[PDB]
Paper text:
Here, we discover unexpectedly that a single mutation R86A Akt exhibits intensified autoinhibitory features with enhanced PH domain-kinase domain affinity. Despite the NMR HSQC analysis suggesting the possibility of structural perturbations induced by R86A mutation, the X-ray structure of the R86A PH domain revealed very high concordance between the WT and R86A PH domain structures, with an overall RMSD of 0.198 for main chain atoms. The structure of the R86A mutant was determined in the same crystal lattice as the WT protein, and their main chain conformations are essentially identical. In fact, apart from the mutated Arg86 residue, only the side chains of Glu17 and Tyr18 showed significant structural changes in the R86A X-ray structure. By contrast, in the R86A PH domain, the Glu17 side chain rotates away from Ala86 and the side chain of Lys14, and this rearrangement appears to induce an alternate side chain rotamer for Tyr18. Paradoxically, breaking the Arg86-Glu17 hydrogen bond by R86A mutation sharply increases PH domain stability and promotes a Tyr18 rotamer which enhances the binding of the PH domain to the kinase domain. The R86A PH domain displayed an approximately threefold greater binding affinity (KD 37 μM) toward the kinase domain than the WT PH domain (KD 107 μM), supporting the idea that R86A mutation stabilizes the autoinhibited Akt state by promoting the PH-kinase interdomain interaction. Differential scanning fluorimetry revealed that R86A has increased melting temperature (51±1°C) compared to WT PH domain (42±1°C). Notably, these R86A-driven CSPs have a higher magnitude compared to the CSPs due to the interaction with the kinase domain. This supports our hypothesis that the R86A PH domain is preorganized in a rigid, stable, conformation suited for tight inhibitory interaction with the kinase domain.
Author numbering: 3 to 42, 49 to 121
The structure:
Amino acid sequence: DVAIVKEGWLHKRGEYIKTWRPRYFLLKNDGTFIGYKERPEAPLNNFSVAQCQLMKTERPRPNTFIIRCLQWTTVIEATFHVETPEEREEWTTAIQTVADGLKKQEEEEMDFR
């Protein structure tokens, strides 16, 4: 029963270039977070938000949020900008709710085996 939770345009900072480009992202309730060059082609970005930490910053762009994940030895970061703080709150709340549901599932599978 995997379904889209939230979708929309985000300004994503490149991990390589560090410039900002618009990407159309869809978040699903299983943690899938997929980003396209055009509103729906293979996606340009594809990663799970399970076990992510969300951070907010105002520099260099206001209304920035960062999704940070620790996987083996690597830190994955994804940096996004939206035009208003309200939109940032909408995205970070949606991502956090999905991540929290996945964490509950993880606890039910891993605790007291």
